Each structure stands twice: as structure tokens, then as C-alpha cells.
Amino acid sequence: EMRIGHGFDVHAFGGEGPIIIGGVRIPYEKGLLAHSDGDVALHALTDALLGAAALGDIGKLFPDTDPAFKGADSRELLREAWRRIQAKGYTLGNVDVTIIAQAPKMLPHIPQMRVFIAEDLGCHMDDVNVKATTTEKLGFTGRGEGIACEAVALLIK
Amino acid sequence: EMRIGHGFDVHAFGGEGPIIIGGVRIPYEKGLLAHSDGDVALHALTDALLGAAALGDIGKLFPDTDPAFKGADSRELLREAWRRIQAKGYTLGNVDVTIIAQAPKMLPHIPQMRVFIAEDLGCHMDDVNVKATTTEKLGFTGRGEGIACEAVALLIK
Amino acid sequence: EMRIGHGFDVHAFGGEGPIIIGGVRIPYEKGLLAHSDGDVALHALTDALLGAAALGDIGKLFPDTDPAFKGADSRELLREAWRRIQAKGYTLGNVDVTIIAQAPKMLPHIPQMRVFIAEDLGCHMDDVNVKATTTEKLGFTGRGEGIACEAVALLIK
Numbered sequence: 208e209m210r211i212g213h214g215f216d217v218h219a220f221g222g223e224g225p226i227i228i229g230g231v232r233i234p235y236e237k238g239l240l241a242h243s244d245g246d247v248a249l250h251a252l253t254d255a256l257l258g259a260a261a262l263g264d265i266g267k268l269f270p271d272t273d274p275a276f277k278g279a280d281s282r283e284l285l286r287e288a289w290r291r292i293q294a295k296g297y298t299l300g301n302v303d304v305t306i307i308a309q310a311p312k313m314l315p316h317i318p319q320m321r322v323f324i325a326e327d328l329g330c331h332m333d334d335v336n337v338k339a340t341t342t343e344k345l346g347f348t349g350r351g352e353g354i355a356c357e358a359v360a361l362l363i364k
Numbered sequence: 365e366m367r368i369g370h371g372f373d374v375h376a377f378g379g380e381g382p383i384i385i386g387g388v389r390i391p392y393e394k395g396l397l398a399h400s401d402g403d404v405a406l407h408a409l410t411d412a413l414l415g416a417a418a419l420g421d422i423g424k425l426f427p428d429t430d431p432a433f434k435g436a437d438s439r440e441l442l443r444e445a446w447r448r449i450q451a452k453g454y455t456l457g458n459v460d461v462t463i464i465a466q467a468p469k470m471l472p473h474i475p476q477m478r479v480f481i482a483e484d485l486g487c488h489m490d491d492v493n494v495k496a497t498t499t500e501k502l503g504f505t506g507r508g509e510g511i512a513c514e515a516v517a518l519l520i521k
Numbered sequence: 522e523m524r525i526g527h528g529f530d531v532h533a534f535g536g537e538g539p540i541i542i543g544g545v546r547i548p549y550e551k552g553l554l555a556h557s558d559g560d561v562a563l564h565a566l567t568d569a570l571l572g573a574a575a576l577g578d579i580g581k582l583f584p585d586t587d588p589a590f591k592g593a594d595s596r597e598l599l600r601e602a603w604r605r606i607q608a609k610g611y612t613l614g615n616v617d618v619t620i621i622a623q624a625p626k627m628l629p630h631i632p633q634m635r636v637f638i639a640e641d642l643g644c645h646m647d648d649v650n651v652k653a654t655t656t657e658k659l660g661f662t663g664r665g666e667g668i669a670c671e672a673v674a675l676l677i678k
């Protein structure tokens with residue numbers, strides 16, 4: 208048996224950069240108002256994998272309430288989310304991540320994101336796709352007011 | 365094999381509360397404008413299941429011609445879409461639903477939404493993920509102009 | 522066993538039409554602005570196919586850098602991507618494509634899109650599903666500033 212999951216995340220710009228996307232530090236004018244590192248790509252991926260497990264969302268495992276993972280970075284959370292998902296007997300099929308930002312340009316840093324995620328998930332990189340796209344200057348991303356990320360995932364049994 | 369489907373729906377706030385999400389009446393300042401009951405979560409789920417089965421979308425199972433379902437609430441539609449989907453010999457894999465609203469708060473109502481979808485698709489609650497997230501005041505969701513919802517689904521032959 | 526992919530595309534209105542969506546020339550008041558033919562439906566799908574394959578995206582296979590695919594249309598890019606995907610030993614499971622447009626009406630032209638896609642992907646039409654929906658006047662789509670599209674794909678190993 209196999210399982211579909213889906214992740215969505217948005218953070219607005221604010222403060223001073225740089226920014227944290229897919230574990231990778233990316234140089235940029237502004238930063239991201241967030242309850243943690245605000246790694247939008249990792250959050251969505253995390254929500255997507257938990258969704259395939261039906262373990263709800265990251266908000267559910269890691270409330271601002273629990274003191275246990277309070278102040279953890281996105282890479283930490285993804286590792287713990289994953290271990291819990293694995294506890295349910297699941298393993299990785301594959302994952303696809305879609306970054307939506309007018310700027311900065313992601314491509315230089317994408318190869319590094321995919322390496323970062325594959326370690327955190329202990330899979331081949333063949334199982335990790337990341338990509339970036341614009342909304343051609345339309346919407347809140349277009350006006351450069353924020354970054355958005357979707358992600359999909361397939362878990363196995 | 366298994367079949368993927370995707371669903372996306374939006375409604376604007378307008379008129380008087382309450383709003384109906386995943387079959388659950390959620391008190392709110394305004395309500396959702398729709399020819400239907402405005403249940404974006406179920407409309408999106410229904411389209412994902414229909415899409416997985418290659419059956420079009422709601423507009424194609426329920427055209428302004430067919431009087432049978434004029435004014436029928438979103439759960440009745442979901443079950444008929446399910447009937448027609450089953451009739452092709454598909455069973456449910458799992459589903460994942462992401463409600464995108466700045467407000468109201470969805471968390472206490474999600475367990476019930478998950479309950480109703482389970483019934484309506486005759487499955488374990490284990491097969492059904494519902495999550496909620498915001499766009500941090502950005503876009504039309506952020507400014508409180510409406511609610512969106514994304515859904516993915518996996519069918520089995 | 523199987524592999525999920527996801528693709529998202531957006532183009533803006535400018536210039537004369539018609540627009541080309543899913544390979545289909547649809548008459549409309551304005552056209553889409555793009556380096557390409559503007560086909561967000563074939564692009565988003567292409568990206569979903571390449572994401573399933575961990576083959577990257579369109580920006581990676583056919584960059585703006587390389588003037589070799591100057592004048593290439595979305596279907597040509599689609600069949601090329603698919604060739605490369607098949608060469609890595611993948612077949613098609615199914616695809617689901619969701620057009621997000623306030624206007625024009627996509628219904629008359631949808632069945633044809635499916636034909637073009639299935640022939641391009643060398644599959645049965647029952648493996649292709651395409652639907653259309655509005656944002657109910659909300660957002661950049663809602664105000665008629667552009668057309669978004671979102672696609673999911675499932676490949677077979």
C-alpha cells in the first residue's frame with residue numbers, strides 16, 4: 208500500500224535576511240516573519256509527509272505549547288516528524304517540492320536543498336525533487352510580499 | 365495500480381454566518397457566497413476523487429440541467445460522486461485536505477470533519493487527513509476576503 | 522511501485538489572443554505574456570511529470586539560456602520531457618490538471634485538451650483528467666490579471 212500527502216506554507220517578508228529555504232541559507236534584502244526559522248519549503252514538505260501518515264500537521268506535533276521542541280529549526284522538526292512517521296512502519300516513496308517566490312533565485316541553492324532533505328529522510332536523492340517558480344509579478348508573491356511553497360509526498364505502507 | 369487526483373476551490377465571504385466546512389457549521393462574522401452551501405473542503409475533496417477517477421469535476425457530474433441535485437448540500441454530492449466513482453471499480457486509498465483561511469479557527473472542528481468524510485466515503489478515520497493553515501495576512505485569504513482549500517486523493521483499482 | 526509529482530504555473534494577460542491552454546487555441550480578448558507560448562496547463566503538467574521523475578523542472582531541461590528551444594511550443598516541450606522520462610524507465614499512471622481562470626470558459630475546449638495530452642503522453646484518455654475552476658473574483662486570477670494552473674502526476678516504475 209502507498210499514501211499521498213500534501214503540504215502548503217506561506218511566510219511574509221520582514222526583519223533582516225538572509226533567508227532559510229530547504230535548510231539552505233539564501234542571501235537577500237529582507238527576511239521572513241516566522242514562529243521558527245520559517246523555512247517554508249521544509250514546513251510544507253513536513254506537512255505533506257505527516258499528511259500521508261494522517262498525523263495531521265506540524266502544528267499538531269509541535270505546538271507553541273510543548274516546550275520539548277520549542278525553538279527548534281525546521282531541519283530538526285523534519286527529522287523528528289520523520290522518525291514518528293517511521294514508527295508507524297512507513298518509509299519514503301518519493302517527494303516533490305515546489306517553491307513559489309518572485310525572488311531570490313533558488314537554482315544555485317537547489318542542489319544543496321535536495322542533498323539536505325535526502326539526509327534528513329535517509330533516502331536516495333533520486334527520491335527528492337525541488338523546483339522553483341514565479342507567479343510572473345501577480346499576487347502577493349509577485350509583489351514580493353512573501354514566499355509560498357507546495358509539496359507532495361508518497362509514503363509506503 | 366493507484367490513481368491520483370487533485371482538487372482546489374475558493375469562496376468569498378458574504379452575507380451572514382455561519383460557514384460550513386467539512387460538513388461542520390462554524391460560527392463566523394460573515395458566511396460564504398455560493399450557489400451551493402459553500403463547503404470548500406468538500407468541494408475540493410470531491411474534485412480530487414473525481415479527478416483521480418478521471419470523471420471531470422462537480423460541474424460535470426452535476427450540470428445546471430440535472431434537477432436531482434439542485435440545492436443539495438455538499439455531503440449529498442460527495443456521496444453521489446462516491447457512488448459513481450465506486451461504480452467504475454475504484455476503492456479509497458487515502459485523502460489529504462488543506463483548508464486555507466485566515467479565520468475562523470478550524471482546529472476544534474477538524475475531528476468532526478474527519479468523522480463525516482469517513483462516513484461519507486465508508487473508510488477508517490485513518491484514511492482521512494484534514495489540516496488548516498493561513499497565508500500570514502497575504503493574498504485574498506490573508507485580507508479575509510475568502511477561504512480556499514486544496515485536496516489530494518489516491519484511488520485504488 | 523509509483524512516483525508522485527506536482528507542477529504549478531502562472532502567466533499574465535497582455536497582447537492579443539487567443540490563449541493556448543492544454544494545446545488548445547481558445548479565443549479571448551487578450552493573450553498570455555510568455556517567453557513560451559504561455560500554456561500554463563502544459564507547463565504545470567510537464568513540471569509534474571519531471572517532478573515525479575526527479576528530473577527537475579522545465580527551467581532545468583530547457584533553460585532560457587539555451588537558444589536551442591527558442592520558438593518551441595509547450596506540446597513539443599511536453600513530448601521531449603516525456604521521452605527523457607520514459608528513457609529513465611518510467612511509464613504513465615495518471616495525470617490531473619486544474620486550470621484556475623476567471624475567464625474564459627474552458628468547458629467547450631476541455632475534451633480536446635485531453636486528446637492532445639493523451640496522444641502526447643501515448644496513453645489512454647482515461648488516464649488524463651482536466652478540470653477548470655474560478656477564484657470567485659478574488660486574487661489576481663479573480664481580477665482577470667492572469668491564469669494559474671496546478672497539476673498532479675503519477676508515474677509507474
Ligand SMILES: CC(C)=CCC/C(C)=C/COP(=O)(O)OP(=O)(O)O
Nearest residue numbers: 346347499503504512660661662669
Ligand atoms: C494563497 C494562494 C491561494 C495561493 C495559490 C495561488 C493563487 C491562485 C493565489 C491567489 O491569491 P493572490 O496572491 O492573487 O492575492 P492578491 O493579488 O489579491 O493579493
Ligand SMILES: Nc1nc(=O)n([C@@H]2O[C@H](CO)[C@@H](O)[C@H]2O)cc1F
Nearest residue numbers: 264266465468469470471496497498
Ligand atoms: N484557519 C486556521 N485554523 C486553525 O485552527 N489553524 C491552526 O493553526 C496552526 C498553525 O498555523 C495550524 O496547525 C492549525 O492547527 C490555522 C488556520 F489557518
Ligand SMILES: Nc1nc(=O)n([C@@H]2O[C@H](CO)[C@@H](O)[C@H]2O)cc1F
Nearest residue numbers: 308311312313314339340341578580
Ligand atoms: N525563484 C526562482 N528561482 C529560480 O531559480 N527559478 C528558475 O527559473 C526557471 C524558470 O522559472 C525555474 O525552472 C528555475 O530553474 C525560478 C524562480 F521563480
Ligand SMILES: Nc1nc(=O)n([C@@H]2O[C@H](CO)[C@@H](O)[C@H]2O)cc1F
Nearest residue numbers: 423622624625626627628653654655
Ligand atoms: N474558467 C473556467 N471555465 C469553465 O469552463 N469552468 C466550468 O465552470 C464550472 C463551474 O466552475 C466548472 O465545473 C467548469 O466546467 C470554470 C472556470 F473557472
Ligand SMILES: [Zn+2]
Nearest residue numbers: 216245247250
Ligand atoms: Zn511556516
Ligand SMILES: [Zn+2]
Nearest residue numbers: 373402404407
Ligand atoms: Zn464551491
Ligand SMILES: [Zn+2]
Nearest residue numbers: 530559561564
Ligand atoms: Zn509557463
